[PDB]
């Protein structure tokens, strides 16, 4: 519900003197937004749901190629009609066999033959459609207010601290004004519009791994199939039968099932998680405008923390050009601002590292409180520092 | 000489393709007020100011004053993605569409 730790994160500084920002959210991604003199926040799309699909086709990979039949007809006696031709109980196909006296027939030459094999389905590579008002979005907003390695990911704690929220967006009401206590409020106007990709693509289902395939590659493929009935057509894939046999037995070899035919065309179609009745669109996106002239700082009338500050471990690389770390405050005093900055060289006067966790501060007055901090240090070597003078501590860092 | 409909408007289903580069759809008016003009247009992107989709059913409007009346509408949207919209501001609803 917040950005820290995610690989699909994007940092933003709307505009210059902007109280709003235009943005784009998608499936498993998050966004951290910064704005002069205002808290940092994370807009993130949580879920995409239709709050009703329908099947269209069903290609099979098969079994039942067990029962056999071979209606024999002697030369000049015409064709052969197998009783197993009255019901789709079996699939029949005619042929002719060279014969005569040698095998019970009176004359010599080509005799009719019409055998049949049975057909039912096993593994149905089912597929369905996606009709374009039932689309609802779930956006979660976080506030980079005080936190600890611990509480940073706990949705509960955060809501409790009024530093988080999870609301939904609908074509009905595409906006919302999420209130965050003394932090004012943020009002998004996400516009349900999305690419996005037209319903034109079919919904391919294969065993467990669902995919999104092109109407045609799918529809225009070669495999047995069935719409919404127990009736199957084109079962001709019950092939490699015509050993061009004898009236006794026509080998009806079950055609080897090679999932390669499918698998091979994997990459083409995009993969998608699908539960019995749901298809989370990633695939999908959402253009929003994070208006936030109503987003406001807090604890700005407090004094600076003046007591020792200790690191609780080597800062970590977020993989985003920023690092995280957690402090501990020896301080006995209450809610004070945390004096942390990024300095290019020990005892420089002017900072150089911008803090993601802007305007940090010890939340409680209960000494030895923890403080989480994410900041982007300058490239190359630099120093993170907390406190000043002889209280001040530091830890070096080198970005690349 | 009537005023614009000012009450919620709900879609009654996914617009349909006429096969002519236009689509059809039917609205329902929560409105209790009488014969007012239906505020529907085709917008290229949410909250744009100028329309882009020409309405076949020009100058549409709720025929009766009997709330929850239905309105049929055929309009040609622009190629590619676009948005159909009815009403404005926080009353306004919308539904996306992509012509080819």
């Amino acid at each position: 519900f917040n950005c820290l730790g995610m690989s699909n994160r994007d940092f933003l500084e709307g505009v210059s003197g902007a109280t709003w920002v235009d943005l784009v959210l998608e499936g498993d991604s998050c966004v951290t937004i910064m704005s002069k003199d205002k808290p940092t926040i994370d807009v993130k799309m949580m879920n995409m749901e239709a709050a009703n699909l329908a099947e269209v086709r069903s290609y099979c990979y098969l079994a039942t190629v067990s029962d056999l039949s071979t209606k024999a007809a002697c030369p000049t006696m015409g064709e052969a009609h197998n009783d197993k031709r009255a019901d789709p109980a079996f699939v029949c196909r005619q042929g002719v066999v060279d014969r005569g006296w040698g095998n019970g027939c009176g004359l010599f030459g080509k005799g009719s033959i019409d055998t049949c094999a049975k057909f039912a389905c096993s593994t149905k590579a089912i597929g369905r459609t996606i009709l374009k008002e039932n689309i609802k979005y779930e956006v979660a907003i976080f506030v980079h207010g005080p936190t600890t390695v611990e509480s940073h990911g706990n949705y509960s704690t955060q809501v409790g601290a009024t530093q988080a929220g999870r609301f939904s967006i609908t074509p009905a009401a595409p906006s919302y004004t999420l209130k965050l206590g003394e932090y004012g409020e943020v009002t998004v106007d996400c516009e349900p519009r999305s690419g996005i990709d037209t319903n034109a693509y079919y919904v391919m289902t294969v065993g467990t791994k669902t995919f999104l395939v092109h109407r045609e590659w799918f529809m225009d493929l070669n495999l047995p199939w069935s719409s919404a009935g127990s009736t199957v057509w084109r079962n001709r894939e019950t092939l490699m039968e015509f050993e061009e046999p004898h009236a006794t037995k026509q080998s009806v070899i079950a055609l080897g099932s090679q999932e390669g035919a499918l698998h091979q065309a994997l990459a083409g179609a995009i993969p998608v998680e699908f539960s019995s009745n749901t298809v989370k669109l990633t695939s999908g996106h959402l253009k929003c405008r994070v208006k936030m002239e109503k987003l406001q700082l807090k604890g700005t009338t407090y004094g600076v923390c003046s007591k020792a500050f200790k690191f609780l471990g080597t800062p970590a690389d977020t993989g985003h050009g920023t690092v995280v770390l957690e402090l501990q405050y020896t301080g006995t005093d209450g809610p004070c601002k945390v004096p942390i900055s990024s300095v290019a060289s020990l005892n420089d006067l002017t900072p150089v590292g911008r803090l993601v966790t802007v305007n940090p501060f010890v939340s409680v007055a209960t000494a030895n409180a923890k403080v989480l901090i994410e900041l982007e240090p300058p490239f190359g070597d630099s120093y993170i520092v907390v406190g000043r003078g002889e209280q001040q501590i530091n830890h070096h860092w080198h970005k690349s | 000489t009537y005023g614009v409909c000012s009450k919620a408007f709900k879609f009654l289903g996914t617009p349909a393709d006429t096969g002519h580069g236009t689509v059809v759809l039917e609205l329902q008016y929560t409105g209790t007020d009488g014969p007012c003009k239906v505020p529907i247009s085709s917008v290229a992107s949410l909250n744009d100011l100028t329309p882009v989709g020409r309405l076949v059913t020009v100058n549409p409007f709720v025929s009766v004053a009997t709330a929850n009346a239905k309105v049929l509408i055929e309009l040609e949207p622009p190629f590619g993605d676009s948005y159909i919209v009815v009403g404005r501001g926080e009353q306004q609803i919308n539904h996306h569409w992509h012509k080819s």
Partner: antibody
Amino acid sequence: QVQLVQSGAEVRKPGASTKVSCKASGYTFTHYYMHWVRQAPGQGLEWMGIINPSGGSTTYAQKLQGRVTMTRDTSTSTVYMELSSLRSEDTAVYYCARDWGSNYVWGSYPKYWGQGTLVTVSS
Amino acid sequence: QSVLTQPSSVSGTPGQRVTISCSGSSSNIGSNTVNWYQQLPGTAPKLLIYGNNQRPSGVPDRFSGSKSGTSASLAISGLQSEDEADYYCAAWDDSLNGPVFGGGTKLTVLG
């Protein structure tokens, strides 16, 4: 799976009010409308109204307009129904039910039902 | 008094087919699709049919729905003892601007 857990049975005197809760889980709470439907003992189903947990907008049955209030708390995924000026005829099992998934109030219908809360109004 | 009209009671023997009617008007069934709910004794209703004739997953094919003009019908083939329940039809009503229900039918399964 969708789960809806309602508060326990209640008794009230005529003239009082009752507030019933429905705690939802197993789906994205703010993405589905919640309906309330009641059933007097031995009688049929009566729709009471619907609330959008996104934004909190409501539509109530005309016959209950003026003494029913539906609300929600999105942080606890709970929907509430309060009915005031109770009379004996309000004795019923009160069900909350998650909508099928409509994106519009029009054409919504209850699909996943809670276990019901019996409210008896008696002197 | 309910907006849609159903028989109060239907009965059948195990194995037979029974039907349950649901009559409405042009403002509900005439215009909009019909849903059916099954309510086993002592339990909440469950959705049985939606959109006139669609079954949710888990509902067997021997339950089938239909609609014709301003009326709808539920047919239950292969009647089983466990089918004994109250059945309710439902539809959106354009005139009332909300969902309406039938009065319910108690289905009893005889010996």
